[PDB]
C-alpha cells in the first residue's frame, strides 16, 4: 500500500493567487502520478498525468512537477471557477491509490445574506403541516446563524438547514432554513421571524410576516 | 469515449448490488476498466480494476470478497457486485479507464449512488413558495420550491423545464427520521413574476413521482 499524503486539506484563496497543493508518496512512484478536478456535483476529471502533463483541455494555470516521492500542483493565477476537490493519485503499482484530497475554496470580499420568507403553502396546510422557510441568499463567508421567532419568543425545535456548495461564479454561499410545525401550532401565532447573524452586520438581518 | 454507468440504488443491508458501466467510442478489450469508491464527505478509494481482454483483475486489499468485477465483452459493459453490503458501503461508485498501462484515470463515468437502508421508499410532496401576500417594492423576487418528506435520493428540480436557471439555489437534501427535505430558490425581477409564468418541476424516479408546481401569488 503506497501512501499518498497530500496537502493541504482545504484552503481558501483569492482570485489571481497562485495555488500549490502538494502530494507525498510514500515509496518511489516514479512521475505515475495524477492529478484530478472534481467540481461540486460531478466525477473527477483529468488535470495533470505522468507527473507533469497537461491533460488535453486543460488550461494553462494548471501545472504538474515532481518525480519519484515529491509531487506539486500549481494553479498560477486561480479563478472563480477552480474552486473544486483536488485528488493526486499514484498508478504506478498495484494496488493504486489516492490522496486525501484538496478542498478549494475561493476567498472574495465579505456579502451581507439577502434574506426571504416563506409563510406554508396552502396545500401543505391543507394535508396538515405547516413548514416555513427562509432562503439566505449569496453571502460570504460561508459561516452564518439563523434564529427562528415566534411572537416574539424564540424557537428552536423542527429546524432543518442546508448550505449549498460555493458559486462557481460570484463565489458566495446560499443558505436554507425550515421550521416545521404542526397546522394547529402555526395557526395558533402570528409573526413568524427568522433572524441571520452574520459578519457583515453588528445587528441580525431579519424577515418577518404576520399571518393574520 | 463515454462509460455510461446505471442509475441510483436502494438495497437493504445484507443484500447484493450488482452496477453496470457501458462503454463505448472505443475498442473494449484495449483497455483496463476499474471502480472508484466515495462516500460523501470523502476522498477516492480505489476498488479495482478488470482487463476485459484477459479476465485478468487486481483488488484494492479492503475490497476483496466485498467487490467483484466482471465483463460481458459481447456489449462492451463492465460490472461490480457488492455484497453484504452495510451503510458504510453507501456510497457514489464511479467507473474509470486506465489510459493503457500509464497508470492514469482518462475517463470517468458519472457514478452510480449506492444507498443502503432498511427505510422504506416513500414519495416527496412539493408545495409551491410565493412570496408574503401583499404589495412588493424591490426590483427583483424570489420564489421557492419544497420538497418534503420523500426517500431515497435522488430527486431533481428545475424551473420551468431548465430554460430558468440564472439566479436558482437548490439546496442539498437533509434527512431527517428516514425522509429527506430539499428547497429550491429562484429569484427573478419583478417585472418578469407574476406576469410571466414561473413553474417549479420536480422528479423522484424510485417513487414514479413527477409533478409540475406553478407558483401563484398569494
Known amino acids: 500500500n503506497i501512501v499518498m499524503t497530500q496537502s493541504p486539506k482545504s484552503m481558501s484563496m483569492s482570485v489571481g493567487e497562485r495555488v500549490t497543493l502538494t502530494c507525498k508518496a510514500s515509496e518511489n512512484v516514479v512521475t505515475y502520478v495524477s492529478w484530478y478536478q472534481q467540481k461540486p456535483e460531478q466525477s473527477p476529471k483529468l488535470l495533470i498525468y505522468?507527473?507533469?502533463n497537461r491533460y488535453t483541455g486543460v488550461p494553462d494555470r494548471f501545472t504538474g512537477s515532481g518525480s519519484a516521492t515529491d509531487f506539486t500542483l500549481t494553479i498560477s493565477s486561480v479563478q472563480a471557477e477552480d474552486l473544486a476537490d483536488y485528488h493526486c493519485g499514484q498508478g504506478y503499482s498495484y494496488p493504486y491509490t489516492f490522496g486525501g484530497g484538496t478542498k478549494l475554496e475561493l476567498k472574495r470580499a465579505d456579502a451581507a445574506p439577502t434574506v426571504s420568507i416563506f409563510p406554508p403553502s396552502s396545500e401543505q396546510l391543507t394535508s396538515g403541516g405547516a413548514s416555513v422557510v427562509c432562503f439566505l441568499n449569496n453571502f460570504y463567508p460561508k459561516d452564518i446563524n439563523v434564529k427562528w421567532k415566534i411572537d416574539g419568543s424564540e424557537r428552536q425545535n423542527g429546524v432543518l438547514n442546508s448550505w449549498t456548495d460555493q458559486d462557481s461564479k460570484d463565489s458566495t454561499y446560499s443558505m436554507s432554513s425550515t421550521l416545521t410545525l404542526t397546522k394547529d401550532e402555526y395557526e395558533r401565532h402570528n409573526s413568524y421571524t427568522c433572524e441571520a447573524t452574520h459578519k457583515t452586520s453588528t445587528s441580525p438581518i431579519v424577515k418577518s410576516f404576520n399571518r393574520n | 469515449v463515454q462509460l455510461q454507468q446505471s442509475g441510483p440504488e436502494l438495497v437493504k443491508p445484507g443484500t447484493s448490488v450488482k452496477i453496470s458501466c457501458k462503454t463505448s467510442?472505443?475498442?473494449?478489450?484495449?483497455?483496463?476498466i476499474h471502480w472508484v469508491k466515495e462516500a460523501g464527505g470523502k476522498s477516492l478509494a480505489w476498488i479495482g480494476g478488470?482487463?476485459?481482454?484477459?479476465?485478468?483483475?487486481n483488488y484494492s486489499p479492503n475490497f476483496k470478497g466485498k467487490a467483484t468485477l466482471t465483463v460481458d465483452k459481447s456489449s462492451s459493459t463492465a460490472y461490480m457486485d457488492l455484497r453484504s453490503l452495510s451503510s458504510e458501503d453507501s456510497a457514489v461508485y464511479f467507473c474509470?479507464?486506465?489510459?493503457?498501462?500509464?497508470?492514469?484515470?482518462?475517463?470517468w463515468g458519472a457514478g452510480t449512488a449506492v444507498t443502503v437502508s432498511s427505510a422504506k421508499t416513500t414519495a416527496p410532496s412539493v408545495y409551491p413558495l410565493a412570496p408574503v401576500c401583499g404589495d412588493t417594492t424591490g426590483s427583483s423576487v424570489t420564489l421557492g420550491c419544497l420538497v418534503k418528506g420523500y426517500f431515497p435520493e435522488p430527486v431533481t428540480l428545475t424551473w420551468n423545464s431548465g430554460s430558468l436557471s440564472s439566479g436558482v439555489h437548490t439546496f442539498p437534501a437533509v434527512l431527517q427520521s428516514d425522509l429527506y427535505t430539499l428547497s429550491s430558490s429562484v429569484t427573478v425581477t419583478s417585472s418578469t413574476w407574476p406576469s410571466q409564468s414561473i413553474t417549479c418541476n420536480v422528479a423522484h424516479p424510485a417513487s414514479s413521482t413527477k409533478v409540475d408546481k406553478k407558483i401563484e401569488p398569494r
Open positions: 505522468g507527473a507533469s
Open positions: 478488470i482487463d476485459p481482454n484477459s479476465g485478468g483483475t
Open positions: 467510442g472505443y475498442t473494449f478489450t484495449e483497455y483496463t
Open positions: 474509470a479507464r486506465i489510459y493503457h498501462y500509464d497508470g492514469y484515470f482518462d475517463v
